[PDB]
Amino acid sequence: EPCVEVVPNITYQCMELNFYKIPDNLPFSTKNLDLSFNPLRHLGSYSFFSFPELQVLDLSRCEIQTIEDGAYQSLSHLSTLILTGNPIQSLALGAFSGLSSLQKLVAVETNLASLENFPIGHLKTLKELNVAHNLIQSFKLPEYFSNLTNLEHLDLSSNKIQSIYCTDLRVLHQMPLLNLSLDLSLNPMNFIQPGAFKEIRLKELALDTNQLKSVPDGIFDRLTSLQKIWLHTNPWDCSCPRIDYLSRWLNKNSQKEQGSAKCSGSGKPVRSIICP
Ligand SMILES: *[C@@H]1O[C@H](CO)[C@@H](O[C@@H]2O[C@H](CO)[C@@H](O[C@@H]3O[C@H](CO)[C@@H](O)[C@H](O)[C@@H]3O)[C@H](O)[C@H]2NC(C)=O)[C@H](O)[C@H]1NC(C)=O
Numbered sequence: 001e002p003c004v005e006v007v008p009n010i011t012y013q014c015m016e017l018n019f020y021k022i023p024d025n026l027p028f029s030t031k032n033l034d035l036s037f038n039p040l041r042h043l044g045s046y047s048f049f050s051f052p053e054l055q056v057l058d059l060s061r062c063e064i065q066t067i068e069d070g071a072y073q074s075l076s077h078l079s080t081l082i083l084t085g086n087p088i089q090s091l092a093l094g095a096f097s098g099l100s101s102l103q104k105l106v107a108v109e110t111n112l113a114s115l116e117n118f119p120i121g122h123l124k125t126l127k128e129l130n131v132a133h134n135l136i137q138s139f140k141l142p143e144y145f146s147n148l149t150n151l152e153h154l155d156l157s158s159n160k161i162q163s164i165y166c167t168d169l170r171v172l173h174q175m176p177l178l179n180l181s182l183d184l185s186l187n188p189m190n191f192i193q194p195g196a197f198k199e200i201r202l203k204e205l206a207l208d209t210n211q212l213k214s215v216p217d218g219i220f221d222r223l224t225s226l227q228k229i230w231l232h233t234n235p236w237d238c239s240c241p242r243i244d245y246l247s248r249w250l251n252k253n254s255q256k257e258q259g260s261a262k263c264s265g266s267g268k269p270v271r272s273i274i275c276p
């Protein structure tokens with residue numbers, strides 16, 4: 001092969017080797033294939049017919065614009081699919097067909113602008129979905145998120161997200177077993193509508209390095225099983241009595257905070273402020 005072998009008959013790195021099509025002079029038993037950095041461009045149906053036993057697949061920066069019905073049709077054991085950095089435009093409404101075991105799906109910087117046309121609804125076995133560094137402005141989990149009854153880390157960081165509205169996290173009301181870590185850092189976010197988080201079950205919640213100056217009263221008060229939160233590196237307005245609630249909450253929830261929310265201008269920790 002022109003590929004490289006790390007574990008014989010098991011692990012192949014076909015990176016950077018100028019491929020225009022999926023290789024095939026490789027063992028049908030292959031469990032780990034890295035194809036990143038090859039002008040693959042398009043993913044027609046049955047693209048991976050010759051590797052029914054693949055567990056991990058890397059297609060990072062492969063210039064892929066289209067993926068069609070059944071490109072991964074015979075990958076019943078795929079656990080991890082890395083699609084990072086492909087200018088995907090057309091995405092077939094059955095592109096993730098036959099990914100029956102899929103656990104980790106990395107769609108980072110793949111030109112996503114809304115999760116709504118994201119055909120992952122039949123991927124019951126999904127545990128983590130990373131859609132950082134896309135073009136999402138309105139982050140509203142669509143209905144299909146019901147099925148994701150195993151989802152436990154959703155990364156939505158470094159998008160274009162400016163607001164959290166109530167509706168956005170609605171679908172999680174009927175997901176009572178959901179132990180869900182939600183990353184929303186490095187968004188240009190300055191506004192959280194009141195009630196956004198009520199009657200929702202978050203294990204972890206990141207809201208740091210946005211542009212939050214304030215949060216509505218009670219925003220977290222009814223937030224089930226929260227274990228960690230991040231609020232640091234935000235321009236917190238520590239005027240009283242605006243900051244009263246968050247200040248109170250951070251003290252009442254000290255164990256859960258990661259880092260420290262500081263006041264803009266001051267630099268003093270938000271938890272340190274006692275309003276009249
Ligand atoms: C996310 O958290 C939920 C809710 O806390 C988890 O539900 C819990 O599931 C366990 C089983 O994993 C239940 O324990 C069961 O009961 C007895 C122990 O008393 C044991 O003998 C049984 O064999 C069984 O393990 C537990 O009752 C239940 N919730 C609570 C706190 O009572 C769920 O596992 C988590 N789900 C995900 C998708 O991460």
Ligand SMILES: *[C@H]1O[C@H](CO)[C@@H](O)[C@H](O)[C@H]1NC(C)=O
Pocket residue numbers: 008009
């Ligand atoms: C790899 O596995 C194949 C198929 O089971 C076997 O025929 C072959 O001996 C192995 N290759 C070597 C020699 O590492």
